[PDB]
């Protein structure tokens, strides 16, 4: 304790809390993968451990001790980097999510802009996977999925511009403190709907999964991936859903602001509701055609986001 200083422990406790958040997020994403699979089975009216909870652990052991394989005629660097980007994109974006007063990895001024930076880089995982795979059909599927993403990544930020407008800041804590009275789910309702649609599309979750369904010359950008590298994409998707869910709580549901339960409990409670809301959506939603998803993103969501921001501005300036 000789070297220990009141300031050092502050710069040590903070690092510890950041590592705790990182671990809890990765755990939550992995657990949800199992929790979902089981719930989906219950909906379809159909174990390794406690209620199958150890199935997640079993899969990890199998994937770790599975022969790792990079196609002989595949760019090793690009092939290996794709899964890495998928796992360490939205995970890094969680650094801006304030889970409770006194618990935020990074209180950045750019705030929400950091999520957009990471969401923008996530597209390369799909593109790199397709090109490196060396499977002509994988390339077509990757390109279809990438075009679908860009069709939803276009209004992703604009969907959150009404919230930023009301808060007058990109900082997430400022955005939460600005929902003290009314959560942005009510005033920025169209923003919430559009952001949810774009968020699931960015995470490549239902119904934006399987973008290669119509094309018989398309297979998927995960066909050549096996073992942990295959798992990194799967886990990355669920970690991304957790990150999106935690962003919706922070942006449209007042974050950790709740009437009685402890602040952190509220954050978790709401985040869990969103994580399971996506689960209800997966089961109760017919996948639309690739043409429909492309058109809906450019002809409906993009115009709506542009209009919501203009109307929000008018109301704000009028009330002032």
């Amino acid at each position: 304790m000789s070297w220990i200083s009141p300031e050092l422990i502050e710069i040590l406790l903070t690092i510890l809390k950041a590592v705790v958040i990182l671990l809890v997020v990765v755990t939550c994403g992995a657990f949800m993968s199992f929790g979902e699979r089981r719930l989906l089975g219950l909906f379809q009216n159909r174990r390794v451990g406690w209620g199958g909870s150890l199935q997640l652990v079993a899969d990890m052991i199998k994937m770790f001790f599975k022969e790792d394989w990079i196609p002989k005629f595949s760019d090793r660097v690009i092939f290996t980097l794709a899964p890495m980007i998928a796992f360490t994109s939205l995970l890094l974006a969680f650094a801006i999510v304030p889970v409770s007063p006194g618990w935020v990895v990074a209180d950045l001024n750019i705030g929400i802009l950091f999520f957009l930076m990471m969401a923008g880089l996530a597209v390369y995982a799909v593109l790199f996977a397709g090109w490196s795979s060396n499977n002509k059909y994988s390339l077509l599927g990757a390109m279809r999925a990438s075009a679908q993403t860009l069709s939803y990544e276009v209004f992703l930020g604009l969907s959150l511009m009404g919230v930023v407008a009301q808060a007058g800041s990109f900082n997430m804590t400022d955005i939460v403190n600005s929902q003290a009275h009314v959560w942005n789910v009510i005033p920025q309702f169209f923003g919430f709907i559009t952001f949810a649609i774009a968020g699931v599309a960015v995470c490549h979750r239902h119904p934006f999964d399987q973008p290669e369904a119509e094309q018989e010359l398309a297979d998927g950008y995960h066909i050549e991936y096996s073992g942990m590298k295959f798992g990194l994409f799967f886990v990355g998707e669920y970690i991304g859903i957790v990150t999106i869910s935690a962003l919706m709580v922070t942006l449209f549901f007042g974050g950790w602001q709740g009437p009685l339960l402890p602040p952190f409990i509220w954050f978790a409670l709401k985040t869990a509701f969103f994580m399971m809301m996506f689960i209800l959506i997966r089961a109760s939603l017919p996948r639309p055609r690739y043409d429909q998803v492309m058109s809906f993103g450019w002809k409906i969501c993009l115009p709506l986001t542009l209009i919501n921001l203009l109307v929000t501005a008018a109301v704000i300036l009028w009330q002032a």
């Binding site: 001024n109 750019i110 930076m117 923008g120 880089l121 397709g130 077509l140 990757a142 094309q215």
Partner: protein
Amino acid sequence: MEFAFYICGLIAILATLRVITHTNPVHALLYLIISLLAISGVFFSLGAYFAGALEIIVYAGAIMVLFVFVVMMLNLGGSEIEQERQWLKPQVWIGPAILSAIMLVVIVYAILGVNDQGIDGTPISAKAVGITLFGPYVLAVELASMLLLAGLVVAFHVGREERAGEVLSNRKDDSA
């Protein structure tokens, strides 16, 4: 701040050199993205938080995506040009390199003779930039929309396909 400026500044120069001398097009683009992330760190180190984010959101998350799309669409790479590796031949790069070196020397000389109180690094926010964009520089934002509209119209006119179908065969003069 100082470490960030020099380390990111160096990561950028090294990556940029790998880009201009690379044979694989996608690898060259990867090193270009790496250099853009490095320049974003330089921007953040100088207090340009807005420019910092845009460097990753628009340059390394949009303009570069478009480049990769084209390389993957036309299956670029392995062409006789990238097989001959002519750029590596000394008689091909020595002349260009000398012109560039002399240009750098003359430019650096002018820079070394400028007043330098140093860059503090006080963060300039996106709010401040927005007040300037929709205040003194209003005509710029309105005319910038027309510039991007021109890019959209021209890129569509010359970039549109006359043959329908997600997969097309490379025919001379794109005969249909």
